[PDB]
Structure formats: C-alpha cells, structure tokens
Amino acid sequence: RDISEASVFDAYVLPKLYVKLHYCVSCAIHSKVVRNRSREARKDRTPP
Amino acid sequence: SQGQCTL
Amino acid sequence: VTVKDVNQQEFVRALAAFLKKSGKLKVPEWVDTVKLAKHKELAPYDENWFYTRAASTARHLYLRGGAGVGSMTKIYGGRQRNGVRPSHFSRGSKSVARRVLQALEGLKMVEKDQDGGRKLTPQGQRDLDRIAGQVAAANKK
Amino acid sequence: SLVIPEKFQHILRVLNTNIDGRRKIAFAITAIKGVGRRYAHVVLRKADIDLTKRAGELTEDEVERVITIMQNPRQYKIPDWFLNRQKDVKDGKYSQVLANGLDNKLREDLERLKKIRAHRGLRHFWGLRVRGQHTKTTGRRGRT
Amino acid sequence: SKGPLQSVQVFGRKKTATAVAHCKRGNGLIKVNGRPLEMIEPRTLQYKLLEPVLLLGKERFAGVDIRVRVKGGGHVAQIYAIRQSISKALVAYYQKYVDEASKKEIKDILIQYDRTLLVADPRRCESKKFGGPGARARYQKSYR
RNA sequence: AAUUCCGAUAACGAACGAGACUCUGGCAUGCUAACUAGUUACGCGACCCCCGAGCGGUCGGCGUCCCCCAACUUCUUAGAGGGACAAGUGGCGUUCAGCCACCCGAGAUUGAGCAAUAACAGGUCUGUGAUGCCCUUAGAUGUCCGGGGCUGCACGCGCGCUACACUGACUGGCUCAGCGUGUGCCUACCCUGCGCCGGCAGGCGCGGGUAACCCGUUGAACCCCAUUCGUGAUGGGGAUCGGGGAUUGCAAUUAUUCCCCAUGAACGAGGAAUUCCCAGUAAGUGCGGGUCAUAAGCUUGCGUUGAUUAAGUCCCUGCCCUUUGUAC
C-alpha cells in the first residue's frame, strides 16, 4: 500500500518475484521445513 | 505477531 | 437544636472563641513552649491552641462519656514520620490536657464518674447547646 | 500588608552570617547553626513578634532583642531541656552555642576525644561509624 | 392516621459496613447517629448520599423518617452503606404499607439509575498468599 | 484450565489425577435462641428551642436475671437447609460436546488445603535420647564460667525502606476497622483500665480480665475541612555526628530502642537490562499475630482508600503431546 499510494499507474502493475528454492537435508531441518515424521508418518505426500 | 490487532 | 445539626469545624472555632472571651479556663505555666503532639516536628503554628483543643475535647466528651487519659490519647494520635525508617503511630500527649481537664473542673463543666473518667455536667451541656444554636442562627443569617 | 515597607533590607549580616530576608522571621534565622526551626518558633513566641512579617521588615530594635535572646536564652527562664548543650563536661553552666560557637565546641570535643584515645574518638579520627552502623554497605559515598 | 408500631428495619453491607435503617411514619427527619443526613463528614460525597432524596419524591421522605446507625466499614463504604440503607428502607415501607404500584415504579426508577442502590456487592478482600507482598503479587526475585 | 466431554474408531467395563471433596466471605425479613450483644419501646434525668409548647430532637447516662420492671433477632455470631447446575431466551457449533450476547438473579470464572507412579547424588547429621562409620575423650571438639565477634570494610551482588515534591508538606479540627494474642507444670517474665507527677520516652497510687464481660463502640494512616510555605536543593528529603534522661535486664561501649535541642551531604523520576500484577486486583497506607527481658526496615495476614489497561498469540524465553532420526 505505501508503494501503491505513490504509484503513478492506474493499478496495472503487480510484479511478482518467483525464485527456485533448493535445500539439502542437513539444513532443510534448520530451515524448519521437513520437520521429522512419525513411523506411519513417513509414507505421506504433499501437505496441505 | 502477538495478536494485537484483528491480511 | 442539638450540636449535630451544625458544622463541626465552625462549632469548634466558635467554642474556642467563646473560651477566649470568657478567659476563665485554667492556663498552665508552659503556654507556648511545648508541642501538642509527640509526632510533630514543630511547635503549634497558631496561638490559642489551648482554647481550640479544649473546644474540640469538650465536643468529643459530649458525644462519648466516661473518657479518661487513656481514652483521650487514643483519639488525638498523630502520623509519626521517622525519616529513614517506616512511619508508625503515636498516641496523644498526657500532661497538657490533664491541665485542660483540670481547667474544665475549675470551670465546673466536668464531673468525676462513678467508676472512672469525666462526665459532662448540666452546666457544660447547657453551654454547648446554646452556642450550637448561635452557630446555627449565624449560619442561617 | 504594606506595598513597599520602608527600611526594607534584602539581606541582614548579623552574627557575621547572612539571613535570607525574603523568607519569614521564624524560618530565616535558622541559618545559624545554633538556631533551628522549633527553636526559632519558641524564641519568637517569647519575643511576641508576629510571624507574618519576613526578616526584611523587622526593625533594628526588634532584631537586637532577637539577637539578645539568641545569645542568652536561659536568662528569660526558658526550659533547660530545650537548650543546645546541657550539663557541659567542662563547666556546670547551661547555655546554647550558636553558629561558630557550636563548631568551636564540637571541635574542642573532637580533639578531646583524640587525646583520651577512646573508641568513639578513634573512629571519629578514622572517619568511620559510631552509632552501630554496618560499614559493609554504609559509607559507600563519601569514601573511595 | 395514628397507627402505632408501623415501623420496618432494614440493613445493608458494603465491606462489613453494617448500616441499619429504622423507618416509620414521622415528620420527615433522616438522622445518622442523631446527626442530620446533610450534615455528614464527607461533604464532597454528600451529593451521592442525597441521591435517593433527589431521585425519589421529597414528599415520600417527608411522610416517613429514617434513622441510620453504622458499626463497621470505612468512609466511602459507610456512605454507600447509608445510601443503600435509605433506598431499601423506602422500598420496604412502600412494599408493606402503601400501594404496590408505586413500589414497582420506585424500584424500576432505582434500578434504571443504578442497580447498586439495592444489591450488596459480593466482592470482598482477597487473602494474601505467601511469596509476595500482595495477595496476587509476588516478591520480586532474580536468578542471580 | 484439564484422555474432561463429543464423535470416526478394536475396544468395553473401569481405576488413579483433574474433577470431586474440605476451609473462610457473599441470603432470606426463613428456623432454632443467644444480659457474655443489639433493636424497638417503657418509667426517669441532663439539656436544646419554647406558652405549661412537641406522638418534638440526642445521650454508649439509669434498669426491664432476687424483676414483672416487655418482647424479638434486622443489624453482633453459632447450628441446620436450598439458592448457581450453562437452568431459561437468542446466536455459533458435523445441530453433538462445547463458546458468547441477554433477562430475571446476593453472585453468570469468589479465593485457599489435600493433590497419580517416579527422577532428583536437591538441602537439612546445626530438630530431637533417629542413626551407620570415623574423629578430640580428662592439655575433650562434652558440660561449667568470663570476655571478644558474629555487625568489622577498600570493592561487587538479592529482597527491601526513605524520599527526589505543589495531586506536595506543616499546623488545627472531623469522621470509620477486623482477624487476634493477652497472668504460663518445669519459668521469673501477661493485656491493660482509672486517677496523679513529669516538657518526652517515663514514673506513683487505685482496679478489671484465666476472657463476646477489660483494654475496646479497638475514636489507626493518606483520605474530608481551614491556615502557612510557592518552584528557591526552598519548615518538606534526614543520612552522620554531640549533649541531656528514662526504658529493659547483671550489664546498651563495639550506641536494643526511645524522647528534646542540635551539623544538616546526595536525592530535577535514573543508560542498559528485568520483575510482579487482570478485580476489591495492582498500588498507596497502615495495623495485628510469628519472632520477644525490650523490641521489625523480615514474614504471614487483616483492613481503609482503591482505576485504565486484556479476554489474545507463541514474536522473545520455557513446559506438554505426537510424528519421531538416534551405537544414547
């Protein structure tokens, strides 16, 4: 909103930043992503 | 991030 | 009218003025060189403190009878500040108002009770009621 | 309550020390080391001088009588227990010491305590406690 | 007319402030220990004391009389104990001896103004619990 | 708040712990009956206005246990019972558990004791004539006496008190308190009232209480009112020191403490950085009991004054549960 107020454009500009992300497993945990799962937990998939 | 206000 | 339907502050001031006008209350030798209370840091600010306190004392004796030295000292206690140490409570003094109750005895307004203490005489009660009526009349007009 | 009273002095230089005239008579004479607040009240009562007026409005005759009361208060049959020093060790006379007199007497007592080599005198010379203080946390300001 | 023993006595409490009202038919005198209602020590809170007088009809408090005696409480507590005493003394008298239609309207007016005129507040002093100077508080502690 | 409860469900019956139970305050114009308490009146007296006035107004001044010279418990408390259980209306909710608004209601979350197995190399041998082992034992580390320090002092650390002011402080007056201890086997030592003397702590004579009976209607403190000081480290803040006296015991100097006159330094709200607190709460402010020959700046409680902040989360620091790598 602070940028939008100063924006000249008639609400036609919405730039998006898309960046590929790659973490190995030693620091995947530190990032907090991939928290450890339960014994039946492992057999899962995407999450929601 | 303390639930002060009430995205 | 009784003494209840008049202002307490103005009634005390009027009685103190009446005692000053009469000039018959007994005055001790130590007039303006002693403290009224133990807790105080200074001598009484204004003169006639003997008359003003005698005026208030006669009023307290009117409300409650059979009051002696121990009863009076509880009443007039004062907030004793001891500087660095936490402050405590100090009872009223003893000897000075013993001259007051001897002064009232000299003026024939207190009488020794059957078991102890001093009780209001008809002369004292009559005087307190008429000055109360004068106070009420002055307040109205 | 006069607008501009005559013979008004902003300060007074009696007893070699200035007294703040803009304050009241009962509270400006207190700069003397022998005259405090309560003592100032009782002497004014003895001198029957009104307390409303300040130190700068009192006449010369009133000031002189106040000074005389200061110097010899026991003459006016004031209570003995009210005196500064009572029952002096060196003399049997009862009197009050004022300003440099109080300092002179105190130094005479202090040098006397040093000569006798008593416990109070030794710690006074050492600059320490006397009245049962706890120097574990007492004396943390005036001593390095 | 001259109906004897037409008196009702009510009580109110505000933190152990026991105020008793002895209400009967009379000229309209309200006294506390024989001391007038207006001539009370808290003159600042005198308006609060006279609130039932200003809210209900002065004719009603002239037909009846109230006597208040207090043994316990404080200063604000005692004023409210007396204030609630005369309010429910008038309510009790208006319940027992006069038309109940007016009893409903005065009760409705009292509730509309402030419910505390009739209810005794349940909240009392809460016992202190060890570990801190107040009942809920804790004595400040540090790890080192 | 809660594996409490509800539901899909290989769990059903249960049990431990929350819960539940027990302690104190919240109430009927309910009961029982309380002179060791009050209320209303009764026959008085003291008075106030006033004609002799008025069913006038106050008395914690008299008595209604040798009495007919009256009863009752609303207020003072001590026995028993319901009332508050999300019960009733509305909304949210898998229409279930549960959550919120609302009316009648003394109160719509009133505070506390006990509090599952077990882990602490948690602390106490200085709590017992509970104790293992070692240790000085007649120049004892015992018992007996006396004195000294346990407080010392350059410096840092915890909880705390006093204030840095004008909503203030000083002087004078006025109006309210409850829990609660109060004369002891060995143990002398209790609470105090009344009256007098003394400027004050204090002293002297006369009594009550082994206790709802006396202190004590516990006339406590800011608080309510009137005067003074008026932005000046200014009567306030009062640390340290001198002198005088009583207090307690044998004894107070290395001052138990207290009373009067005194010197009268910092203290313009304090950087980091943390703690406690959500309703009678915090906080102010006192006052009891524990301590004691005398005692509190400690501690537990009882009060009077007594508000806003929030009904939220795990952002910082930590616990619980599961999924759970793991030679632990």
From Swiss-Prot, chain A:
According to the record's subunit comment, the protein's assembly and interactions are: Component of the small ribosomal subunit.
Localization terms from the record: Cytoplasm, Cytosol; Cytoplasm; Rough endoplasmic reticulum
Q: What does this protein do?
A: Component of the small ribosomal subunit. The ribosome is a large ribonucleoprotein complex responsible for the synthesis of proteins in the cell.
Compositionally skewed regions (Basic and acidic residues) per UniProt? 37-47
Counting on the full-length protein, the chain here runs from: 51 to 98 of 115
The entry sums up its family as follows:
Belongs to the eukaryotic ribosomal protein eS26 family.
Q: Which residues carry this modification: Phosphoserine?
A: 4
Annotated protein name in UniProt: Small ribosomal subunit protein eS26
From Swiss-Prot, chain C:
* Cellular localisation: Cytoplasm; Nucleus, Nucleolus
Omega-N-methylarginine carried by residues: 64
Q: Any idea which residues bear N6-succinyllysine here?
A: 140
- Listed GO biological process terms: cytoplasmic translation; erythrocyte differentiation; Notch signaling pathway; ribosomal small subunit biogenesis
The UniProt record lists the keyword RNA-binding: no
Q: Which InterPro entries match?
A: Ribosomal_eS19, Ribosomal_eS19_CS, WH-like_DNA-bd_sf, WH_DNA-bd_sf
N6-acetyllysine, modified sites: 20, 108, 112
Q: Where is the signal peptide?
A: none
Which SUPFAM superfamilies does the record associate with it? Answer: Winged helix' DNA-binding domain (SSF46785)
Using the UniProt record, give the first listed, main subcellular location: cytoplasm
Task: Report whether Ribosomal protein shows up as a keyword of the record.
Answer: yes
Annotated keywords: Acetylation, Cytoplasm, Methylation, Nucleus, Ribonucleoprotein, Ribosomal protein
Q: Gene Ontology terms, cellular component aspect?
A: cytoplasm; cytosol; cytosolic small ribosomal subunit; nucleolus; postsynapse; ribosome; small-subunit processome; synapse
This entry's Gene Ontology molecular function terms read: structural constituent of ribosome
Note the subunit structure. Answer: Component of the small ribosomal subunit. Part of the small subunit (SSU) processome, composed of more than 70 proteins and the RNA chaperone small nucleolar RNA (snoRNA) U3. Interacts with RPS19BP1.
Function noted in UniProt: Component of the small ribosomal subunit. The ribosome is a large ribonucleoprotein complex responsible for the synthesis of proteins in the cell. Required for pre-rRNA processing and maturation of 40S ribosomal subunits. Required for pre-rRNA processing and maturation of 40S ribosomal subunits. Part of the small subunit (SSU) processome, first precursor of the small eukaryotic ribosomal subunit.
Q: Which family does it belong to?
A: Belongs to the eukaryotic ribosomal protein eS19 family.
The protein's name in its UniProt record: Small ribosomal subunit protein eS19
UniProtKB/Swiss-Prot annotation, chain D:
Q: Which GO terms describe its biological process?
A: cytoplasmic translation
Entry's Gene Ontology cellular component terms:
cytoplasm; cytosol; cytosolic small ribosomal subunit; nucleus; postsynapse; postsynaptic density; ribosome; synapse
Q: Which residues carry this modification: N6-acetyllysine?
A: 93, 105
NCBIfam families this protein is in? PRK04053.1
Q: What is its main location?
A: cytoplasm
Q: Member of which family?
A: Belongs to the universal ribosomal protein uS13 family.
Per its UniProt record, what InterPro entries does this chain match? Rbsml_uS13_C (IPR027437), Ribosomal_uS13 (IPR001892), Ribosomal_uS13-like_H2TH (IPR010979), Ribosomal_uS13_CS (IPR018269)
| Modified-residue entries (N-acetylserine), positions | 1
Give the taxonomic lineage as stored in the record: Eukaryota, Metazoa, Chordata, Craniata, Vertebrata
Q: Which UniProt keywords apply?
A: Acetylation, Cytoplasm, Isopeptide bond, Ribonucleoprotein, Ribosomal protein, RNA-binding, rRNA-binding, Ubl conjugation
- Which PROSITE patterns does the UniProt entry name for this protein? RIBOSOMAL_S13_1, RIBOSOMAL_S13_2
Write out the annotated subcellular location.
Answer: Cytoplasm
Pfam families for this protein = Ribosomal_S13
Protein name, per record: Small ribosomal subunit protein uS13
Q: Which SUPFAM superfamilies match?
A: S13-like H2TH domain
Q: Does the keyword rRNA-binding apply?
A: yes
Q: Where is this cross-link: Glycyl lysine isopeptide (Lys-Gly) (interchain with G-Cter in SUMO2)?
A: 90, 93, 105
The annotated subunit structure for this chain is: Component of the small ribosomal subunit.
- Keyword check for rRNA-binding: yes
Q: Native species of this protein?
A: Mus musculus (Mouse)
Source organism, top-level taxon: Eukaryota
Show the GO MF annotations: rRNA binding; structural constituent of ribosome
Q: Which HAMAP family match?
A: Ribosomal_uS13
UniProtKB/Swiss-Prot annotation, chain E:
Q: What keywords does the record list, in alphabetical order?
A: Acetylation, Cytoplasm, Nucleus, Phosphoprotein, Ribonucleoprotein, Ribosomal protein
Q: Which GO terms describe its biological process?
A: cellular response to leukemia inhibitory factor; cytoplasmic translation; ribosomal small subunit biogenesis; rRNA processing; translation at postsynapse; translation at presynapse
Q: Which residues carry this modification: N6-acetyllysine?
A: 58
Question: Could you tell me the superkingdom of the organism this chain comes from?
Answer: Eukaryota
Q: Which InterPro entries match?
A: Ribosomal_Su5_D2-typ_SF (IPR020568), Ribosomal_uS9 (IPR000754), Ribosomal_uS9_CS (IPR020574), Ribsml_uS5_D2-typ_fold_subgr (IPR014721)
The subcellular localization recorded is: Cytoplasm; Nucleus, Nucleolus
- List modified residues, type Phosphoserine: 1
Q: How does it assemble?
A: Component of the small ribosomal subunit. Part of the small subunit (SSU) processome, composed of more than 70 proteins and the RNA chaperone small nucleolar RNA (snoRNA) U3.
The record's function comment reads: Component of the small ribosomal subunit. The ribosome is a large ribonucleoprotein complex responsible for the synthesis of proteins in the cell. Part of the small subunit (SSU) processome, first precursor of the small eukaryotic ribosomal subunit. During the assembly of the SSU processome in the nucleolus, many ribosome biogenesis factors, an RNA chaperone and ribosomal proteins associate with the nascent pre-rRNA and work in concert to generate RNA folding, modifications, rearrangements and cleavage as well as targeted degradation of pre-ribosomal RNA by the RNA exosome.
Name of this protein: Small ribosomal subunit protein uS9
